[PDB]
Amino acid sequence: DGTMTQEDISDYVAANMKDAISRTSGVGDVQLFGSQYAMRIWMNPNEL
Amino acid sequence: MPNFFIDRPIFAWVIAIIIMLAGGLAILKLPVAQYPTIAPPAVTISASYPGADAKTVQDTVTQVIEQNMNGIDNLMYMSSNSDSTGTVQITLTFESGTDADIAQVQVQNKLQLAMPLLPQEVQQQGVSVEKSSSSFLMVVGVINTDGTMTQEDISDYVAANMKDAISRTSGVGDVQLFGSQYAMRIWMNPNELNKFQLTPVDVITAIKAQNAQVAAGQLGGTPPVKGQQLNASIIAQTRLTSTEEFGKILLKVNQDGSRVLLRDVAKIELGGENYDIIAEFNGQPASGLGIKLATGANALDTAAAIRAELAKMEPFFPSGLKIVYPYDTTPFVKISIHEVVKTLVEAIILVFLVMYLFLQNFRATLIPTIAVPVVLLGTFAVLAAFGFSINTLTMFGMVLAIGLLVDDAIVVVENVERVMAEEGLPPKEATRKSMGQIQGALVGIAMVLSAVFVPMAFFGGSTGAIYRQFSITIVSAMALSVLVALILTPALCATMLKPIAKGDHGEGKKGFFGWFNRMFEKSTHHYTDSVGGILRSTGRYLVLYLIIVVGMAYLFVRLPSSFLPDEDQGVFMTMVQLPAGATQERTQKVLNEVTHYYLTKEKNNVESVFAVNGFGFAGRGQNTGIAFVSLKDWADRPGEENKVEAITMRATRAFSQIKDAMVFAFNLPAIVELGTATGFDFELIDQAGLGHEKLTQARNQLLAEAAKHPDMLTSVRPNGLEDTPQFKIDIDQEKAQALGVSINDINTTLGAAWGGSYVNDFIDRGRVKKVYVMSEAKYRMLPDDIGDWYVRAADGQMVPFSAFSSSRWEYGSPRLERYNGLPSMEILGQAAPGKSTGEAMELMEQLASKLPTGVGYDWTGMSYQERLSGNQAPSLYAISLIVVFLCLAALYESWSIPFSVMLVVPLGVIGALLAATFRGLTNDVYFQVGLLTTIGLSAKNAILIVEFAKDLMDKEGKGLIEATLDAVRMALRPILMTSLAFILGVMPLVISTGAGSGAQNAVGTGVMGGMVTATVLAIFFVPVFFVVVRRRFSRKNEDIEHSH
Ligand SMILES: CCCCCCCCCCCCO[C@@H]1O[C@H](CO)[C@@H](O[C@H]2O[C@H](CO)[C@@H](O)[C@H](O)[C@H]2O)[C@H](O)[C@H]1O
């Protein structure tokens, strides 16, 4: 429904789904096809 | 075999002696325990963050470790607490049968990934991973009987001299010190610090520099110059060892050259690493070690190892120091088992006595008497082969097997007896003939009877090992019983029985016993025509049976059910929980009242009280405590009023008067990890990052709605703590930069002073110990004290905290819970009276579904345990019933005749239900194993009636009704032998008082009542069962008198 971008969906599963799926019965490794959100500080060398 | 050993009596004995030797050895080596291990393994991660509040702990430590917990085999769930003591505990619970070594290995491999990510101070406190039970195995207490050592002295002696060796002992999963090791305590004074323009940063820097152990190499060290003749270690700074040495640490040298020493800005003493835990033994200063049993370890063995380690310490005790034993769960295991050994012996002697009453001959009753211990000792040897343990269920199997065993021995003796007593063969050929015609039956009937036990060897899950060990014991016994009946018993009849000849059973040559026979004689006829009159009956004697059956199913459903009964273990615990915010002093006030109560109002019952301030079931805190109560021996506490249930109820009622505290005494459940059996263990979950305040609100809503359903839910309560006032201080970053004060100096000053700081190590009497820096108590009690602390700016100025900060009161949590990596609150509760727990759980899930958005829930602990499909008895009893019918079909070569044996089943069940009902017992484990026993022996009685009736119709060719009669009690006398000897044999169980009598009383009255009814009733109904079945299932060209 157009509300969540791709970056958004990735954060949602990383933050709310992955950890429990990864403790679920018989689950070995779990690979996220995406990345969890971090606080992103994008620097500007000119303003610095 | 029977013939081979008849001609070889000594070979027979040799086999019996090897069997007994093997059993005897097993008894000396098998583990001993209350139950088979049914507890799921649980690995615990513990860490500490000195001075940290709960949210700091949770967000800086707990969340980090949890996010790293993945790819761990067999993990059922994970929970954790983070509290304002600075402490974390994360518990990972595994499926039953997980190898606890591997679980621990897998957990720690993940933890090691998280470690570099943890704060430096958490790492240096040491984080630990343990595999142990959650309850205490025992508490080893230590006092000083000359009062020449204080609480603190004792605690340090314990930590420094006893704890490590107890911690390294195999089977010891975890050890809690009730007290604290000494540390070098540097108690700072902010007045003097500021006087000399110093901060806690300077104090820390100086200690690290002047309490140092430096590596300085060697004179003439390798590689050396040629011709070197000297080589020696160079020794520089070494760790400081005394308060004097710390006192003279040089902070700085003034302008006029005067010296500022550490002792000029601080009081310096030995003192605990912490001051939270204070323990008393009967009101007297104490320390102790709370010991937890490692996953799967044997409790009795580990207790022994601990005792042995303790004994090695004692001679080197300082004067007055003494070990006391305030709380040990272990003697109850040893004593309760030995008490079952005592009733087992008594059962044998009582069987021997009833043997002798009927079979008057001493050598004839000595034969079954000999069989019993050969079979039972062999059975122990089998248990060993199967890796089982000597426990309550295997021991009960031994006792309950006796009826079955005795029957095999008597059937041989009696057949031989009344082969001699109806022809005239010497005992050697008399037994050969006799064995020739019963050995098939013997083997056969045992297979039919093992079928009533074998299916129940296959229960599943945690309840499963309980019935498996009982079932394998009985079936093992029954097997060996048949073995012995084919090997030893024929041999003993062939060599120990006296010849007879002449159609003999003799009335006149003894006194009392000759009378007994003569009564039984026409008692037998007064019985025979009783049957003959109830054979011309059939009509409404059938109807009575269907009344017993409906009365049986009626009595059944009325009877409540449970798993295992509470036992008086001679010990218990009292929990003390005050509101968060409560001071240590107030928790001591409450502990004093609890101690007082046991010391003065339970003099007859309570032997000692070991009370601990600052420790509770949920973990450390100023507002929590615990009392370990040891009781006087069971023999000095006669009657229900002096047992743990009435004692703890009385005590909880007294303590309910206590103001602003949660105080209650409770018996620890039979097994623990299964819970009191009306109780549910509920988890409320933040599923959408709602946060702690909103979660609290949803918890409150759930609790309120639950409260207005007392008809279904009772005692539904939060298991955690309530929010409390906290002091929020804001560092103003701008002012700090402006004044030139560094944030690291500010935070180290704030935290070192009010929280304490583990600086480095020093050496105390040869032992490495810690060094702590902290404000002296009087400068960290009041909010205004905050501004008395000063930090030094870059430009050398002293700036008071008040210049760069502001503060306010707010509310926060002192204990943050998480379940499966998500923020949670654990809610406890029980089903209301007359309601099932499942019904309470339902209502709970319904109540929970109407909770705000993003709030989920889960079941854990005991509630998890039984959602795990826990009701298999019916289908298993139905399978067992089916295999019994099939086996019986094989025995008689008929599809219909087995019915005449199987109709006996309700006749024994009605007795058990009635007995359990009238003694207010429950449908539990000891009720189910007891009834299979009764059904087994009631079956065996009925089988040998019908066995005779059929063989008199086929071999003799006699008519139906008339061969029933002859059949009917050619076997009464053996059936009354069998049954009455068993009934008087389980009697030590029913009249059992003392340790474990709860289980003995339980298992005993079920069997006794069942067997009493099973046999008095069947002896009139088995004659009926046979004839009614034989008519409904035709053959219209016999009845009346064949021969051939
Ligand atoms: C009718 C015959 C069958 C009935 C008899 C069965 C009784 C079973 C109950 C025994 C309970 C087990 O109790 C067990 O006893 C033996 C003997 O003390 C102990 O054995 C201990 O002492 C003996 C010497 O006395 C040593 O050989 C042994 O090294 C030592 O461990 C075991 O450590 C203990 O665990």
Ligand SMILES: CCCCCCCCCCCCO[C@@H]1O[C@H](CO)[C@@H](O[C@H]2O[C@H](CO)[C@@H](O)[C@H](O)[C@H]2O)[C@H](O)[C@H]1O
């Ligand atoms: C071959 C002859 C055999 C014929 C015998 C037929 C009569 C039936 C025998 C007794 C019936 C079994 O009794 C049954 O025990 C099971 C297993 O503990 C109980 O099950 C209950 O026990 C405990 C306590 O609540 C829980 O651990 C379990 O989750 C629960 O379901 C049932 O409430 C009860 O119905």
